[PDB]
Write an enzyme that holds these catalytic residues in place. Structure first.
Site, PDB file in Angstrom:
ATOM      1  N   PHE A   1       0.866  -1.166   0.000  1.00 40.59           N
ATOM      2  CA  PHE A   1       0.000   0.000   0.000  1.00 40.59           C
ATOM      3  C   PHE A   1       0.908   1.222   0.000  1.00 40.59           C
ATOM      4  O   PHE A   1       1.979   1.192   0.567  1.00 40.59           O
ATOM      5  CB  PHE A   1      -0.852  -0.004   1.279  1.00 40.59           C
ATOM      6  N   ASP A   2       0.506   2.267  -0.710  1.00 38.89           N
ATOM      7  CA  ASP A   2       1.276   3.476  -0.887  1.00 38.89           C
ATOM      8  C   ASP A   2       0.301   4.634  -0.960  1.00 38.89           C
ATOM      9  O   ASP A   2      -0.784   4.494  -1.504  1.00 38.89           O
ATOM     10  CB  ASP A   2       2.119   3.406  -2.151  1.00 38.89           C
TER      11      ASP A   2
HETATM   12  C1  LIG Z   1       6.660   5.131  -3.016  1.00 36.35           C
HETATM   13  O1  LIG Z   1       7.576   4.531  -3.942  1.00 36.35           O
HETATM   14  C2  LIG Z   1       6.984   3.782  -4.904  1.00 36.35           C
HETATM   15  C3  LIG Z   1       5.614   3.670  -5.113  1.00 36.35           C
HETATM   16  C4  LIG Z   1       5.111   2.850  -6.131  1.00 36.35           C
HETATM   17  C5  LIG Z   1       5.991   2.130  -6.918  1.00 36.35           C
HETATM   18  C6  LIG Z   1       7.357   2.165  -6.653  1.00 36.35           C
HETATM   19  C7  LIG Z   1       7.862   3.026  -5.666  1.00 36.35           C
HETATM   20  O2  LIG Z   1       9.223   3.160  -5.473  1.00 36.35           O
HETATM   21  C8  LIG Z   1       9.806   2.097  -4.753  1.00 36.35           C
HETATM   22  O3  LIG Z   1       8.348   1.480  -7.327  1.00 36.35           O
HETATM   23  C9  LIG Z   1       8.063   0.894  -8.607  1.00 36.35           C
HETATM   24  C10 LIG Z   1       9.350   0.245  -9.082  1.00 36.35           C
HETATM   25  C11 LIG Z   1      10.494   1.237  -9.197  1.00 36.35           C
HETATM   26  N1  LIG Z   1      10.047   2.498  -9.776  1.00 36.35           N
HETATM   27  C12 LIG Z   1       9.720   3.636  -9.158  1.00 36.35           C
HETATM   28  C13 LIG Z   1       9.327   4.471 -10.166  1.00 36.35           C
HETATM   29  N2  LIG Z   1       9.513   3.812 -11.352  1.00 36.35           N
HETATM   30  N3  LIG Z   1       9.958   2.610 -11.108  1.00 36.35           N
HETATM   31  C14 LIG Z   1       8.782   5.854 -10.106  1.00 36.35           C
HETATM   32  C15 LIG Z   1       7.376   5.889  -9.502  1.00 36.35           C
HETATM   33  C16 LIG Z   1       6.914   7.298  -9.273  1.00 36.35           C
HETATM   34  C17 LIG Z   1       6.396   5.132 -10.386  1.00 36.35           C
HETATM   35  O4  LIG Z   1       5.168   4.909  -9.684  1.00 36.35           O
HETATM   36  C18 LIG Z   1       4.059   4.887 -10.462  1.00 36.35           C
HETATM   37  O5  LIG Z   1       4.074   4.972 -11.655  1.00 36.35           O
HETATM   38  C19 LIG Z   1       2.796   4.620  -9.667  1.00 36.35           C
HETATM   39  C20 LIG Z   1       1.901   5.814  -9.844  1.00 36.35           C
HETATM   40  C21 LIG Z   1       2.425   7.047  -9.095  1.00 36.35           C
HETATM   41  C22 LIG Z   1       2.466   6.745  -7.597  1.00 36.35           C
HETATM   42  C23 LIG Z   1       3.338   5.493  -7.343  1.00 36.35           C
HETATM   43  N4  LIG Z   1       3.051   4.363  -8.241  1.00 36.35           N
HETATM   44  C24 LIG Z   1       3.289   3.088  -7.871  1.00 36.35           C
HETATM   45  O6  LIG Z   1       3.268   2.231  -8.730  1.00 36.35           O
HETATM   46  C25 LIG Z   1       3.607   2.750  -6.394  1.00 36.35           C
HETATM   47  C26 LIG Z   1       3.060   1.353  -6.037  1.00 36.35           C
HETATM   48  C27 LIG Z   1       1.539   1.344  -6.018  1.00 36.35           C
HETATM   49  C28 LIG Z   1       1.021  -0.057  -5.652  1.00 36.35           C
HETATM   50  C29 LIG Z   1       1.550  -0.509  -4.296  1.00 36.35           C
HETATM   51  C30 LIG Z   1       3.067  -0.519  -4.269  1.00 36.35           C
HETATM   52  C31 LIG Z   1       3.605   0.845  -4.690  1.00 36.35           C
END
Ligand SMILES: COc1cc2cc(c1OC)OCCCn1cc(nn1)C[C@@H](C)COC(=O)[C@@H]1CCCCN1C(=O)[C@H]2C1CCCCC1
Length: 128
Positions: free
Chosen positions: A55-56
């Site tokens: 969860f984030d």
């Molecule tokens: C809070 O940190 C994280 C949150 C989430 C994903 C994260 C993450 O870093 C550890 O790692 C994904 C794998 C590495 N990565 C990061 C990014 N691109 N690749 C940039 C990142 C901004 C990309 O994230 C997204 O595209 C989406 C939408 C924006 C908000 C974060 N997002 C995530 O996918 C989350 C993820 C949501 C589902 C539950 C686990 C975290």
């Protein structure tokens, strides 16, 4: 719960109509305008794996998450989904791996073939 409702009743907002990104509007926003590619978008969000205890949330930092629409900082589903939203809208998105981190995933954070769920509030958007 919320994810299941999106499966059952969500609109398919993909071009290919492959149900890869499904959307429910939870709160209607203001006006008609939605953001252009390149706009800076300001959101609050919560995200989780469908089948997971990950969860984030932006609410943990108590500050909006900001990115440029279409510039590649976020998953494809976010570029697709946020582009459909009005200012003040809250939406739920359910997202198949093809529009998120794919068959590979992105370990350790994201496993193979993960479906993701988000709640997103579009707070504002501003041109370049
Ligand atoms: C809070 O940190 C994280 C949150 C989430 C994903 C994260 C993450 O870093 C550890 O790692 C994904 C794998 C590495 N990565 C990061 C990014 N691109 N690749 C940039 C990142 C901004 C990309 O994230 C997204 O595209 C989406 C939408 C924006 C908000 C974060 N997002 C995530 O996918 C989350 C993820 C949501 C589902 C539950 C686990 C975290």
């Amino acid at each position: 719960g919320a994810p299941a409702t999106v499966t059952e009743q969500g609109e398919d907002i993909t071009s290919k109509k492959d149900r890869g990104v499904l959307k429910i509007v939870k709160r209607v926003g203001n006006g008609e305008e939605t953001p252009m590619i390149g706009d800076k978008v300001y959101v609050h969000y919560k995200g989780k794996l469908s089948n997971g205890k990950k969860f984030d949330s932006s609410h943990d930092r108590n500050e909006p998450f900001v990115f440029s629409l279409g510039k590649g900082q976020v998953i494809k589903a976010w570029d697709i989904g946020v582009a459909t939203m009005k200012k003040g809208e809250i939406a739920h998105l359910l997202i198949k791996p093809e529009y998120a981190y794919g068959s590979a995933g992105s370990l350790p954070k994201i496993p193979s073939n993960a479906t993701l769920f988000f709640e997103i509030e579009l707070l504002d958007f501003k041109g370049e």
